[PDB]
């Protein structure tokens, strides 16, 4: 269910407080490490020589408690950005002092406010703490959805609250976070604690946070309504936000005093538990795809590489995919042998990349469904898999199946095919070089022959995710280009992100390819109208294929094949994030390039500003031929 904690700014005895909040059902406690009112002097005598102790002893909890149950809080008098020089100097010293103490205690996180626009000196001081010894602990930057200045009651006669529509102004708190994090150069240790108020802002203002590293959501007691039986509860819209935040699996923090008295603080908490246990329970995909969220993987290259036995296991574990293939072959057979010919006419069906044989079996199930006669070839270059095929053809298929252990581009067929069937497709359709493989094989398809699939089309959509940008960035490796990470696609269950525009088709391929001169290179230009303010971090890729007539496969979200878990989305990063303003168009350029040896993608953003061309010459990433 839910991981949640108590925020307090009063701890008389840390023993009792912790027990109490544990008793109440909290997983952890956010509290000061020094007394919030205990302003300290570092420079001026006499205050400087204030006899210690400066705070309460580390001996008061176990190492294990400090490690797991406690989040620290910067003292609220500490103002590194004060315009008063002496306050700035003491606030630097005190911020260091307090951060160093959290680190001494081995606290797993430490809360710091972004409660105004200028946090430059705060950023500078935090970045220094981070660049003093490599540690794991997190900084939770406490940012409001809505600036307190824009939340204030309209009760100052000579200083009224402006009610003029304010698109950018209502997003100012995101800019506070954005600027702070940019100064701190996207440290993986700096994340967001999103503080939520009674007034939810516009949905555009909430949308600003879609791709951001939110670790916690702070819920004041204030924002809870009361129901008839006096229980604390939340507005339908507060509930919607909570549901959004549960999907992002953040930790919830309850702050402020009890405003529902003849109820404990577990009443707030039980409400949250109530909402999580009462969420739409996860579909099959959402459970399959669960552990894989924002996890970057190399795209498979099953041409250049021999896939492992367990790789084929998981391909085979997607029945919806093979139902579709059965059905496409089913339909194609009936179209090709009339009932009066069923028994005199036997169709040569060649599986091209047969792996351990599920396409062969589907072809078999299809023919007995169609009550038509089929001769199979099962062509596979991975000789490890050929082992599985040949044990199958001996023990089960018998001689209806000729297993061919060769490359389809090289194989000399004893005869031509009525139908070729292939599943040579990656998450970006042509990224496994299905075009080149099928081009090489097409000379042995009969002049009236069907390829299944007949067609595939790749799609791109620009995305915002500071989370994924940071994950890519952290894939630097010794003994290559320090920026190579950014010039290669990743397969990933895209999760913490914002789609900035509807996907658009990128590259399309047709089989058989009639072209007199066939050329599988490509140059596409795409314009993505963007209706928000945002930061572009890369392009989600998806694909659609026509197996046969109306039978298709898709991971394109708008047309996703339902309950098919094969093929996560692909992600083209860019080296430098690009600010985009509501109304602006993102223009991206993609090339498919090749030698005799290798095929690769190059890409450039050309609007609202230009990127570098990514992966020029295939220097960071290529697909082997």
């Amino acid at each position: 269910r839910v991981s949640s904690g108590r925020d307090l700014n009063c701890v008389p005895e840390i023993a009792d407080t912790l027990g109490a909040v544990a008793k109440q059902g909290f997983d952890f406690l956010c509290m000061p490490v020094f007394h919030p009112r205990f302003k300290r002097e570092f420079i001026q005598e006499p205050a400087k020589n204030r006899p210690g102790p400066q705070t309460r002893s580390d001996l008061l909890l176990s190492g294990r408690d400090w490690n797991t149950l406690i989040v620290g809080k910067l003292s609220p008098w500490i103002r590194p950005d004060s315009k008063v020089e002496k306050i700035r100097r003491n606030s630097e010293a005190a911020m260091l002092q307090e951060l160093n103490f959290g680190a001494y205690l081995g606290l797993p996180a430490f809360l710091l406010p972004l409660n105004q626009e200028d946090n430059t000196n705060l950023a500078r001081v935090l970045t220094n703490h981070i660049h003093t010894g490599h540690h794991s602990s997190m900084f939770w930057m406490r940012v409001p959805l809505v600036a307190p200045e824009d939340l204030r009651d309209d009760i100052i006669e000579n200083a009224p609250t402006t009610h003029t529509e304010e698109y950018s102004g209502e997003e100012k708190t995101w800019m506070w976070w954005h600027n702070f994090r940019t100064l701190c150069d996207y440290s993986k240790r700096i994340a967001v604690a999103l503080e939520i108020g009674a007034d939810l802002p516009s949905n555009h203002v909430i949308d600003r946070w879609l791709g951001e590293p939110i670790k916690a959501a702070i819920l004041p007691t204030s924002i809870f309504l009361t129901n008839k039986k006096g229980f604390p509860v939340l507005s339908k819209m507060h509930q919607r936000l909570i549901f959004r935040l549960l999907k992002l699996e953040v930790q919830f923090i309850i702050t402020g005093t009890n405003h529902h008295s003849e109820k404990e603080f577990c009443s707030y908490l039980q409400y949250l538990e109530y909402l999580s246990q009462n969420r739409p329970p996860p579909n099959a995909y959402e459970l399959f795809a669960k552990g894989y969220e924002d996890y970057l993987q190399s795209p498979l290259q099953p041409l250049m590489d021999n896939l492992e036995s367990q790789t084929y296991e998981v391909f085979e574990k997607d029945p919806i995919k093979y139902s579709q293939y059965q059905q496409a072959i089913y339909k194609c057979l009936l179209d090709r042998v009339p009932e009066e010919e069923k028994d005199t006419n036997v169709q040569v069906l060649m599986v091209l990349g047969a792996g351990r044989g599920p396409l062969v079996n589907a072809s078999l199930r299809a023919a007995k469904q169609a009550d038509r006669r089929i001769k199979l070839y099962a062509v596979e270059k991975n000789p490890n898999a050929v082992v599985t095929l040949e044990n199958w053809q001996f023990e089960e298929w018998g001689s209806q199946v000729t297993v061919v252990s060769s490359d389809m581009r090289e194989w000399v067929a004893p005869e031509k095919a009525d139908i070729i069937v292939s599943e040579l497709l990656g998450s970006f359709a042509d990224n496994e070089l299905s075009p080149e493989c099928l081009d090489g094989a097409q000379h042995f398809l009969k002049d009236d022959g069907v390829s299944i699939p007949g067609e595939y089309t790749s799609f791109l959509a620009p995305i915002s995710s500071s989370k994924l940008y940071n994950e890519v960035r952290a894939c630097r490796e010794k003994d290559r280009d320090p920026e190579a990470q950014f010039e290669m696609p990743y397969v990933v269950r895209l999760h913490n992100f914002h789609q900035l525009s509807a996907p658009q088709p990128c590259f399309t391929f047709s089989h058989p390819n009639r072209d007199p001169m066939i050329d599988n290179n490509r140059y596409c230009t795409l314009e993505f109208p963007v209706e928000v303010n945002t930061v572009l971090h890369g392009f989600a890729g998806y694909f659609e294929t026509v197996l046969y007539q109306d039978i298709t496969l898709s991971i394109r979200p708008e047309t996703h094949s339902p309950g098919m878990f094969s093929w996560f989305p692909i992600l083209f990063p860019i080296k430098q994030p690009i600010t985009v303003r509501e109304g602006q168009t993102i223009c991206v350029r993609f090339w498919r390039c090749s030698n005799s040896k290798k095929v690769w993608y190059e890409w450039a953003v050309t609007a609202p500003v230009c990127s570098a061309i990514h992966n020029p010459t295939g220097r960071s990433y290529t697909i082997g031929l």
Binding site: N9, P46, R56, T257
Partner: protein, 310 residues
Amino acid sequence: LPPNAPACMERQLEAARYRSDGALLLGASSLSGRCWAGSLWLFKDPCAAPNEGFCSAGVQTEAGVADLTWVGERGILVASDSGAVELWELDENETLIVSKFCKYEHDDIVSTVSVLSSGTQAVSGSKDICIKVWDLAQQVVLSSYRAHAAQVTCVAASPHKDSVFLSCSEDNRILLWDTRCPKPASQIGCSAPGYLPTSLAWHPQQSEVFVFGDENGTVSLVDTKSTSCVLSSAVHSQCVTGLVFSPHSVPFLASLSEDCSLAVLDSSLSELFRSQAHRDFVRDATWSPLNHSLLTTVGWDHQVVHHVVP
């Protein structure tokens, strides 16, 4: 130590307030060590403070005391770290101090309380950014205002007007309130935005002038009427924490700072006296009602100092 009185008094002396009869109210917090709590003390011999076994009454508070005020002659209204305003009642004999109400209405440290000229209402301020108006008799919040955009530093009730008080905040606003107006708050202060305001005191006679102190050690004399900044002197080398007017006909201004010094100023904000006696932060000042030349300061150095002001 009387019945119900702690053997030991928390180190950080936060509040000092003479009653009419010359008896001394002390608030103190524990701002360090294992236990972060606080205490209330009555010293009918003011020369015996801060020593705990020469006290008329004393008691332990759950949490630390951020601010203090007398309510008449037996009431103590308390701004807690706990987010509670708490009303402590004196004893008949006046030998113990006993909780009358303790209300958890603020979401953060209660930083500031003031009793309104009424005597039956008070206004608290808090780090939760709100200002609340209290019926003391009924033990409830009548009003609650989110006027400000940062934590509230000071709230000071007008001497003679039970609907009027000042507030100031790190949002750099000084607010003149009047609860009779549908929009009660009016933003007041100098021409240019200057340094955050830290302390407020109404002139005890002219209830349309007050002084504020800022975080840069300047004390400033303001006229609500001309709504412009009359006089200001740079009195302190650190934030001005408290401003206290003497009981005198033409009253003297006691100025306390985190620079650990006391200044006493005339009406024109000129320097008369100054005391380095303290070697930590100076927290409060009260003038003896009995001897108007006596000025009593407390500090975090746990010194109770009696000043003779010439």
